Design a protein around this ligand. Structure first.
Ligand SMILES: NC(=O)c1ccc[n+]([C@@H]2O[C@H](COP(=O)([O-])OP(=O)(O)OC[C@H]3O[C@@H](n4cnc5c(N)ncnc54)[C@H](O)[C@@H]3O)[C@@H](O)[C@H]2O)c1
Ligand SMILES: NC(=O)c1ccc[n+]([C@@H]2O[C@H](COP(=O)([O-])OP(=O)(O)OC[C@H]3O[C@@H](n4cnc5c(N)ncnc54)[C@H](O)[C@@H]3O)[C@@H](O)[C@H]2O)c1
Ligand SMILES: NC(=O)c1ccc[n+]([C@@H]2O[C@H](COP(=O)([O-])OP(=O)(O)OC[C@H]3O[C@@H](n4cnc5c(N)ncnc54)[C@H](O)[C@@H]3O)[C@@H](O)[C@H]2O)c1
Ligand SMILES: NC(=O)c1ccc[n+]([C@@H]2O[C@H](COP(=O)([O-])OP(=O)(O)OC[C@H]3O[C@@H](n4cnc5c(N)ncnc54)[C@H](O)[C@@H]3O)[C@@H](O)[C@H]2O)c1
Ligand SMILES: [Mg+2]
Ligand SMILES: [Mg+2]
Ligand SMILES: [Mg+2]
Lengths: 260, 260, 260, 260
């Protein structure tokens, strides 16, 4: 059971992928600092992680506020003593509309949470890892960043930005024994947020998907070679691999988790 | 002269690549709407363009203001009647510092001008191109967005965003006879933008470049297979190719202009 | 009308893309050396080119035979004096079958004609260009090389090899004022090639396409954002662009011609 | 210990990466079927594997001979009963020379061993895996296939072919619960295969490296962000990740193991 004595700051920890990844890292003996802007979801997640029997604490923090991020990371360093791993995962999906009708205020919001916020967290945590001369970081990008999808102007651009940020961060931090990589999930389901993407692409009425949500879900699944959307639980193991020693000579890489 | 009869809106038109491209398109016959936030630069550029024998006009506009962009685009349409081509090129280079010390305010600034501003222009202009059922767009990305460079966290992420946005826009706009592509210049020189980069990279003291500017320019040119930086004038032709009919079945692509 | 005085060796010249491209280069004043193994196709192609009014000669040659290629290039050099351009285009589509039943002999044949054969030509011709300290080369790859398609194991591998060979050759030949690039056409129609692709994909019965050829054609067209296959006449201008001076700082690049 | 009861066929099992990978898989409880053309290296390699306390057997076989490949695979299924995992790794490094001087016989030999032979193995084994409706495959590509390197025309081309072939095979075999992925090692040292690369690049005297072998080695390490070549033992864990359940929703992907 590796990761014993390791500490991981998970952002967006109250959400689907963040909670699922925290549990896996915990099951592995990792101590977890949960960070999310959503208090209710945060505490519900903290409870599920505590059972795993590892040390764990929560921090309500809006990553777009750098002052709140810096204070929170400092409280984390104070509460756990160090931050070995970072799963820089908080994010917002954005509206769905073709570019000519894309809500402009929403576009800046997507960039601010997904890029600037992810950067606030990476910067503050990286300074700490530098003092430790050790650290492994995984940034959550997306297949939308690998190839811009229809009606997702903002999100796609935010995730493509994350992929480049990951490469630049990998180069800057390499000298301090820190590695930085990214994961790019494709269609993940079910539950919800899969339903959001299905309903909202359907509502657009572009040539890319039907306006019938049941039909859209089939077109999306139908595009995956494995012919299923992925289960949220198929992501934590990729994260763990990128944080652990088997990826020791890997940095600056982006792993599609998309069924082909 | 192809392009005879066409109208191209060029943003960042008072700057290096923007002016060079405007001139080349004017030599081919296209009327030019120049857009830049720098009035002094615009005016010198507008006079050079008119020397080529086409109609040319200037619009002082900060692309970060959507209200200014929409106002300007409307005036461009009132003055020229249409907008056939768009060279979405205004940009800011950003600071040079490793990620752990990257100025946070600058980070948001780079993203707002390079991604949100670029998006404001793309949205307003594509609305007009849809009305025409005709449009060709070229977004200026960068080799920095193709692979994130050291000490350029914000700039590389902004151009990685432009590459994905170009893909999404291409998908969204294909049904209306609009194509959307990008160019990704590598090391281009001489001049102070080339000098700013040599100088500011040298200043960081990172492992990637010497602290001596003469050695940094050597290291940069020495990383290019053609062993020379590119001339700014080796960009206009590429933009013209992506706007004209020789690229009629290409959209959503990104062209490296980098020497190998 | 540039290319006056230029000499272009086109392989696969009797073929569709080859003849289309030779005509366009002839229209720009370039003299054409036509190379193909198919004599009937060649003579009809040559007649079409001469009609353009430029110097032209045909060479029956099987590119898989290095000795035939060497002797042929020597003859083109005596007959025209030099070889400024090369469109390394001859190719074979291969069988269509899922990998577990892909015909092994055919697999080897696809690699020999599409890779080894293109390499024989590229080597022989680059020697002449180094002697002239000038040359521009375009290799015909394919979207199947950019992303391996279903049931096309050999063809995809052959074009993915062409994309790498193009990058190495660009590096190797850079010091001699030689540029080497590639084009990657996607779906092209109508005609024999298109009919074959559709028909043979339908016959496989794989999950990727309908078993009814009428539907398979619609599915292929349907996968394209521009919602049409491309016309081979949308390829010559791209080759011409990669050969001429507007691409002067571009080498080692691969241009998708795929509709999105 | 996952993989208890698993059987993995490893080709090039007498070589560095193949032996290192089989040992790691044996430590996880995997029975190894070692395949190579060199009997003596197989003997030593199998000796090392046995010592991990798992069932292991060796097979002398030239992957370029399809008849030998099918016969060997049948024997493996007879001796172990099934083939759950495949590490398709045998390969030949090729000559080192600028394309214009690349030895043509060697060019073909490289393709035949690295592509056709890997294909022979992939085909025969996928047929078995289809029978089980279960299989995980890892093909060894290389960073040379990700971007064509100077003086390695044949090798880069063969590895670019492997990456495309990996994508096609992932599509073809996905319906039978089989996944196919690749790894792309960068600079791996020390040893004599690394020394061979260093010595032969130095020998070419191209502009890409020093002519002094000692300096070449430093230039290669210096191009790595992590500033060190990777250890061969930093590859096994990646292959194991790609064969195990943590990569359950990943197929058609290529993982660089290159230091940045
Ligand atoms: N679900 C998918 O299919 C999918 C695919 C690709 C990428 N992703 C990405 O994975 C990550 C996690 O996504 P999910 O699937 O877990 O969704 P999710 O909504 O359940 O979780 C995202 C979490 O981040 C939090 N968050 C949002 N804005 C924040 C802010 N300003 N400060 C702090 N926390 C904030 C939310 O409150 C939420 O708990 C995101 O980056 C998302 O874009 C998801
Ligand atoms: N020079 C290079 O080597 C290089 C390499 C890769 C990409 N680029 C990109 O090419 C484009 C043109 O760059 P350059 O080389 O021409 O530099 P430049 O500074 O000369 O021109 C950029 C121009 O955009 C304008 N601009 C900046 N912010 C603006 C705003 N908010 N609103 C309106 N105009 C604004 C500036 O006033 C300037 O005239 C940029 O997007 C740049 O990032 C340049
Ligand atoms: N047509 C398409 O849809 C398409 C799509 C992607 C890539 N391509 C590639 O474009 C190129 C030309 O395609 P096409 O559409 O023109 O096909 P085509 O069949 O019309 O012509 C190919 C030509 O090459 C010649 N040729 C084949 N083997 C040869 C050999 N050993 N020696 C000399 N000549 C030989 C043929 O005789 C023929 O004249 C090929 O490399 C092909 O794979 C075509
Ligand atoms: N060493 C590196 O730095 C590096 C980097 C990228 C990719 N690779 C690739 O990784 C794989 C492993 O290579 P290595 O590093 O282990 O070198 P290696 O020489 O130690 O092992 C290659 C093994 O394959 C065998 N082989 C060669 N031709 C064969 C044939 N026709 N039939 C059966 N077996 C054959 C060899 O005899 C040898 O045992 C190769 O595909 C190689 O090209 C290696
Ligand atoms: Mg990108
Ligand atoms: Mg015909
Ligand atoms: Mg490739």
């Amino acid at each position: 059971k590796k990761f014993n004595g390791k500490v991981c700051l998970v952002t967006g920890a109250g959400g689907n992928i963040g909670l699922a990844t925290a549990l896996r890292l915990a099951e592995e003996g990792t101590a977890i600092a949960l960070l999310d802007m959503n208090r209710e979801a945060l505490e519900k997640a903290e409870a599920s992680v505590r059972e795993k029997g590892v040390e764990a604490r929560s921090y309500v923090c809006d990553v777009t506020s750098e002052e709140a991020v810096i204070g929170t990371v400092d409280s984390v360093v104070r509460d756990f003593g160090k931050i070995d791993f970072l799963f820089n995962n908080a994010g917002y999906q954005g509206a769905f509309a073709p570019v000519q009708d894309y809500p402009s205020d929403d576009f800046a919001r997507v960039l601010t949470i997904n890029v600037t916020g992810a950067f606030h967290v990476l910067k503050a945590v990286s300074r700490q890892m530098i003092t430790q001369n050790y650290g492994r970081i995984v940034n959550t990008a997306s297949m939308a960043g690998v190839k811009g999808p229809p009606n997702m102007a903002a999100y796609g651009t935010s995730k493509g930005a994350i992929i480049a940020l990951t490469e630049t961060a990998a180069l800057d931090l390499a000298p301090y024994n820190i590695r930085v990589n990214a994961i790019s999930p494709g269609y993940m389901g079910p539950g919800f947020m899969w339903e959001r993407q299905v309903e909202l692409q359907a509502k657009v009425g572009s040539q890319y998907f039907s306006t019938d949500p049941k039909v859209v879900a089939q077109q999306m699944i139908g595009s995956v070679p494995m012919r299923r959307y992925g289960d949220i639980n198929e992501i934590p193991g990729v994260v763990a691999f990128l944080l652990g020693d088997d990826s020791s000579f890997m940095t600056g890489v982006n792993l599609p988790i998309a069924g082909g």
